[PDB]
Design a protein around this ligand. Structure first.
Ligand SMILES: NS(=O)(=O)c1cnc(Sc2ccccc2)c(C(=O)NCCc2ccccc2)c1
Ligand SMILES: [Zn+2]
Length: 257
């Protein structure tokens, strides 16, 4: 029985694995993610207010792990968001990233056809009792190189050395989620659409937010993900290009704040 993989991993080894075109679950349905967002066709909707964050400010030591597909930090319901047009508070479950080693191919979403060097996803789950297509709220930040070191990221980057192989975990030095995000001014403009998880089983229960302004990291910070992390316990295939191909918008529309 073969298991799901990204294209780069079928291309780089003898392992039979299900490339994205052949993924099971809900991955072949029609409200899938990621997508290309034509920014001029996204209409402003004033229901889309500022996000409020909470526990994002608190400095913590987080578990971060290599699950064979990405690096994931486990957020354990220690933070939450509301506003942003969302119907309730959503509790933060995990944060992971998608990336390449070249500047124009590591993001999952694209804006007006441009792809970025990485994309970070902070996955949250709707809190119950306020009342399915918006059970999961994913905050997606696009990442490109900049001249400066993004210091907030350094404890994530440094922990990568301790989790080179799939199934390894480690603990990051004290760090807050806010250290990963840009200033609140950069959080004003975002795009919104309803879609899916981007790995199997690709359940169509996500309310997506893609912030318009990319985060910046130093090029060596971005490169560390592909230089330190592997898709295989033999460490023969560097983890990069863990990116699902673009899906069809279909009937859906994208709106923006
Ligand atoms: N790429 S994505 O769509 O943002 C996403 C969202 N939620 C989840 S797991 C999850 C789902 C619902 C509630 C809590 C966690 C996952 C997810 O866990 N996918 C399987 C392992 C993985 C993780 C990250 C990258 C590659 C592979 C992915
Ligand atoms: Zn993701």
């Amino acid at each position: 029985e073969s298991h799901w993989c990204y294209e780069v991993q079928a291309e780089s080894s003898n392992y039979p694995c299900l490339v994205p075109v052949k993924w099971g679950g809900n991955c072949q349905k029609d409200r899938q993610s990621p997508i290309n967002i034509v920014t001029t066709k996204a209409k402003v909707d004033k229901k889309l207010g500022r996000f409020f964050f909470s526990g994002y400010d608190k400095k913590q030591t987080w578990t971060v792990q290599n699950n064979g597909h990405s690096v994931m930090m486990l957020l354990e319901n220690k933070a939450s968001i509301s506003g942003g047009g969302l119907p309730a508070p959503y509790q933060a479950k995990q944060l992971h990233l998608h990336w390449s080693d070249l500047p124009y191919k590591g993001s999952e979403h694209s804006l007006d056809g441009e792809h970025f060097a990485m994309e970070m996803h902070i996955v949250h789950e709707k809190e119950k009792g306020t009342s399915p297509e918006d059970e999961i709220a994913v905050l997606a930040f696009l990442v490109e190189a900049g001249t400066q070191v993004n210091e907030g990221f350094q404890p994530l980057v440094e922990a990568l050395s301790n989790i080179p192989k799939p199934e390894m975990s480690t603990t990051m030095a004290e760090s807050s989620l806010l250290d990963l995000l840009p200033k609140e001014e950069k959080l004003r403009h975002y795009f919104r659409y309803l879609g899916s998880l981007t790995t199997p089983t690709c359940d169509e229960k996500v309310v997506w937010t893609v912030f318009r302004e990319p985060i910046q990291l130093h090029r060596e910070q971005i490169l560390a993900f592909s230089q330190k992390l592997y898709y295989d316990k033999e460490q023969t295939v560097s983890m990069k290009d863990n990116v699902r191909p673009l899906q069809q918008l279909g009937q859906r529309t994208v709106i923006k704040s």
